[PDB]
Design a binder for this molecule. Structure first.
Ligand SMILES: [Mn+2]
Length: 355
């Protein structure tokens, strides 16, 4: 938590809300601990770092990634006078170090887990286990919490008024430019899913059947084809149907880095958002319009709110209302909105007027 001493960026805002499942009858929701996270830091120079992270299976990986990525980038590694090629290399190394050091951090616990499993009669219902093996089982559950979890991440670095985006997974970055002819919205990164052809290709080159992968859509509760952490899929993919044939890790942690974006004389804002936010909007309004809608909602709030945090939080709140109303209306799409995931929205302003 040395990051709590880091200068926060005054040109950005974050809005968020936790996952929720609606109760069948009546009003009342249930939530599991939130697993999203973010960061908005300004370094020495006119150097800025922003990120939105989406975890699953706990939030230990989400926090490990946020903390370590900060350590690998805001402690000197990023320099104003660096060439684009340098910045690409620095981001690439930061993610590689974050992934390798995370896996090294759980190694011992993985070994202890294996040893405890060897002492435990396999396949026996918890209640039928005598007291002796009960204690071991509990220790196994404690180790499981300590080593499990995964995370997707989209990061954006603003260096000498040039913008870079590093992305692993399905979070999104949008650059919204106010042109003479409306608000121009462009998604800077690309979603790493079984619908991303280049990823179906990468998975094809490893020996997996792209057709079956594409059909199924999800690889272990997650549709993201790139993730950080997640030992289940990084080590035991050999034993996972769709992945069985893989010659090397199907799910990787390498980021896709997107070309420098000049921002000189650009007026608008940058949006980083988690999968939970846009997926919820699409569950309620239908396939493919989340980007335009979210950017339009943010546009509207820019004129009414008095801080970027309020701008971001208002949009997150509107999406939550749209979503619960749809489920409550019992209407046509109610079947798609019984619950929603964590939502995070970060907005970094580039001269757009507020209030
Ligand atoms: Mn999540």
């Amino acid at each position: 938590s040395w990051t709590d001493d880091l200068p926060l960026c005054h040109l950005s805002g974050v809005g968020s809300a936790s996952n929720r499942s609606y109760s069948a009858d009546g009003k009342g929701t249930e939530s599991h601990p939130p697993e999203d996270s973010w960061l908005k830091f300004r370094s020495e120079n006119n150097c800025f770092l922003y990120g939105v992270f989406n975890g699953y299976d706990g939030n230990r990986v989400t926090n490990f990634v946020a903390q370590r990525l900060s350590a690998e980038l805001l402690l000197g590694q990023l320099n104003a006078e660096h060439a684009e090629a340098d910045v690409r290399r620095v981001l690439l190394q930061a993610f590689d170090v974050v992934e390798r050091s995370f896996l090294e951090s759980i190694d011992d616990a993985l070994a202890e887990k294996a040893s405890l499993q060897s002492q435990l009669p396999e396949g026996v219902p918890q209640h039928q286990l005598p007291p002796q093996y009960q204690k071991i089982l509990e220790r196994l559950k404690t180790l499981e919490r300590e080593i499990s979890g995964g995370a997707m991440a989209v990061v954006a670095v603003l260096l000498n008024n040039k913008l870079y985006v590093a992305n692993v997974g399905t979070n999104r970055a949008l650059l919204c430019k106010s042109t003479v002819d409306g608000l121009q919205v462009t998604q800077l990164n690309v979603d790493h899913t079984t619908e991303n052809e280049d990823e179906l290709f990468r998975l094809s080159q490893l020996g997996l059947d792209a057709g079956k992968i594409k059909q199924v859509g999800i690889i272990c509760g997650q549709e993201s084809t790139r993730r950080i952490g997640d030992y289940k899929v990084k080590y035991g993919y050999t034993d996972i149907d769709l992945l069985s044939a893989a010659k090397s890790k199907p799910i990787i942690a390498e980021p896709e880095i997107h070309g420098a974006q000049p921002l000189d004389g650009v007026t608008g804002f940058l949006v980083l958002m988690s999968e939970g936010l846009y997926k919820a909007l699409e569950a309620a309004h239908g396939p493919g319009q989340a980007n335009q809608e979210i950017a339009a909602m943010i546009d509207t709030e820019f004129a009414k709110q008095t801080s970027l945090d309020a701008v971001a939080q208002a949009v997150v709140d509107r999406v939550k209302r749209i979503h619960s109303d749809t489920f409550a209306s019992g209407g046509e799409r109610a079947r798609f909105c019984p619950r929603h995931e964590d939502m995070t929205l970060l907005v970094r302003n580039f001269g757009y007027p507020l209030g």
